[model samples]
Target: MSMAMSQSNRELVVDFLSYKLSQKGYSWSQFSDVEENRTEAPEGTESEAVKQALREAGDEFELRYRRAFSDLTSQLHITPGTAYQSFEQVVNELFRDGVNWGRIVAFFSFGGALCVESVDKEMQVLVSRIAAWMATYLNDHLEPWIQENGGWDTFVELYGNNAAAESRKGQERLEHH
Candidate 1:
């Protein structure tokens, strides 16, 4: 079967983090690896349907922005110690005009860039921290706006085929300079 969007947003966040950390010979799970052992769904968290929608949206975000994500890591300089500070400075201005799917994708890309930089610097210790910061940032700063704007379902409706319909050839071509 296809992905079916069965993964949770938190899982995706960790998976993306894990992917980057692996490049530097680290794994997010090696710290405590508590996720697979956690057993409670808990209250206050939304339904699976809601969770799945965002997962789907997030999958699309990574797929469509892979180039921009790789580019950001190559272009940006983020020390592991100061990554979170960079997030604060950049996002406040990123969302200064307002939030949208395009900007949200950029947020994800920026987070990946930070993770890549941390790993590149041999500070794999910071990978999970970046992932947690990203997850919490979404829960605190972005969730309210997301729900108000029809949630991740709306994001999918708008961006699912974003790369499919566009000029894929040119977009996929890496920067030559």
Candidate 2:
């Protein structure tokens, strides 16, 4: 089940922030490292700090995805208004042309690399390779559907082409910091 939290109805942004932050888990340093007893804690400024940090991080991620998609769409000659049309056409073409896995694996390798940033450099490299392998395995199955639909150009038309443009569009615009 999904849950939502809100600080105030008057502040949609604050409520949204709370909703996003509440989804994540974290480890906090406590005074009693050996204590088995968990007790109700008082609310204080620290909780507010934690909430603010999480909200900011969540907001940042949201911004990044938006930025990436916008860049990709522009490069692909797709607008929000034109996306479904492109998708339908691409799907039909893909189905007729047959699918390919090379681009799919490449796409996910890049995405996975973006996702595993906090890991050590060496670990990150390993993770990216694993991600590429997983991407290949996953695409092995997806390629048939894509082929049936048209080709990777559907994706290229949908997202791949204008990625940098998408990134630039969103990365700097959402700065509340």
Candidate 3:
């Protein structure tokens, strides 16, 4: 794409992600660490394609899992002391829902995508913290369960196959209707 087109696509993706995050009650002020380092999409690349992918993936995320995100956000509306532990507990509880790594991955993916072109350093930090927390939880709790349940390969086999089949089932349902 042209320079202008790349920039435009970058802006669209950033704006769209930012709007979604903002709806979750997260603000830039929560991210104080990365206050000066901002992220940007490079020029003269496949930025438009990347932006299109981000949009499609982000939309899919919202459609499939934004309600859970909203639920987690609501559950996190606690006083200062309980917020961190509450987040950890909620994530653990979410993982207990049986092979939900796809949702968990998508959750972190959306947050990472939001951080990719975040102009505000604070916003970048905010999303970084989210990804960090989820990663920590995955390492601490989910990894063990997954390892016991036949390791990463099994998890991927179940989750990936189910997702594609579920998509087809959904499409078939729509067609029948």
Candidate 4:
């Protein structure tokens, strides 16, 4: 069964995920590539129902993620040496509360959207840098914990293969760091 998260909990997860994506050099191309072939409806009735549900879920996630990203960006003060620091407290609190892997993947999805919608080259570059830092932070601080808690398989079972692929791609980007 899927776990229900409170609004605050959801926000915290999205905020932290966005922070990680920003720290990791997330991009529009990467985002587009991940979701590109994943949204199509499969052949015939039962599978078509499954596809429809997945599409609806994707739509909801995008809407929710945009709202979460908006919340995070609106709070920025622009007083930074690094963007990660601004989100550190939120990340820490979520970690303390035991954030799930599925939410993390959702955050990554939204992060790509934020990158795609950036107003200028400078904003895009900054988002990428933030993604780099967030990715490193996940590699250093969270990956081990995730592994101990059931690793990527658990995430795949919970969210689906497409999200898992997107997450793996995110990790691949971090492996170079």
Candidate 5:
């Protein structure tokens, strides 16, 4: 399953959970530090270790703006009933200006927040449902963009350890405000 130069799509979704878990204070829900997870990049493709870094970047990205997603769901009329509609509308607009790794990270953070909100409403089923949709968004809608940008490896190189860079990168573009 795990290897040296590849990461399955589903794995990314799990990595996206870093933000939500951190917010909930789930210390048990930790991954190895990104600094230790770093490794050499293979020529012409991404190394598996970078995938680990990407996951850490995801952890940081999601947590960095976890509040935005929460505030987002709160501002919008989102519930299980309106979730799909809300997702469709938000995403159609998320990339309205353009799609970037920052927006993608925000995308996952939004999903995690929505999933938690679902659980709060006694509809844990939405977690899996939301995860599926998220995976779809990345693998289908965002896949083309990812390859052109040099894949998840590049994402890690940018955001993995440098969590603070996001604010400088304009985290606002992806938010509802």
Candidate 6:
């Protein structure tokens, strides 16, 4: 393909991925926003509550992306230029380790998109500010790791439940356990 066509194709892939991720994030956040859901994170917290709330939605992101990518690969009959993990990385992590890396990434992307859609046009300055803050942090922190690891190794290493935490009963719950 010509350079221009290649660039446009790349952009299209990126945009499609971004849109899908945002949709999943919004749906996950909606589920979390339900007051009746015990898994809802306290407002302004992006911790476990947010993670659990987005679990299935995140997995679905991986599933859908994998399918779309597979279809593209089959149609084009091309291989990746560089060595990297298969698209199944997300699926494997979700099924094998119970980590929802896709959801985490998607949620932050969604936050940024919404901020752009609402910023300067609405009176919700504080909300826009928070979304911008999250988008900045998530992009700065997550992007490098993803570039280096080709996915979310750093995130899993840092936040995955592989560490141990002591319980009130004096029993330690090993995160990896």
Give Cα-based local distance difference scores for all models: 0.55, 0.34, 0.46, 0.44, 0.57, 0.35
Name the regions of candidate 4 deviating beyond 4 angstroms.
1-69, 77-81, 96-98, 101-106, 113-121, 147-151, 158-177
Model 1 agreement with the true structure over 40-130: per-residue lDDT tens digits: 3322354445434444555666776576556555555566475567667666765776465655656656666676666566664666676
Which model, 3 or 6, shows the larger TM-score? 3
Cα-based TM-score, every candidate:
0.54, 0.24, 0.40, 0.43, 0.61, 0.25
Alpha-carbon error at 155 in model 4, in Å?
A: 2.9
Error of 1 at 79 (Å): 0.9
148: Cα error in model 5, Å: 5.1
lDDT score at residue 31, model 5, on the 0-100 scale: 39
The best candidate by lDDT is: 5
Worst 10 residues of 4 by lDDT: 1-10
lDDT of 5 at 29: 28
Candidate No. with top TM-score: 5
Clashes of 6: 1
- TM-score sort, best first: 5, 1, 4, 3, 6, 2
Model 3 regions lying over 4 Å from their true place? 1-34, 38-58, 77-84, 100-103, 109-131, 139-168, 171-177
Off by over 4 Å in 5: 1-7, 18-51, 59-67, 76-78, 82-84, 156-159, 169-177
Candidate 1: residue pairs that collide: none
On lDDT, who's better, 1 or 6? 1
Candidate 6 residue lDDT tens string, 47-131: 3432432343344453444543343324322222211142234334433542224434344333333333332234234332443
Stretches of model 1 off by over 4 angstroms after superposition: 1-7, 19-76, 147-149, 155-159, 164-177
Collision count of model 3: 0
Collision pairs in model 5: 4-48
lDDT string for model 3 (19-137, tens) is 56555555667664534335663435444443444455445645665556556545543332233565656656665763534444344444434344342433453554554454454
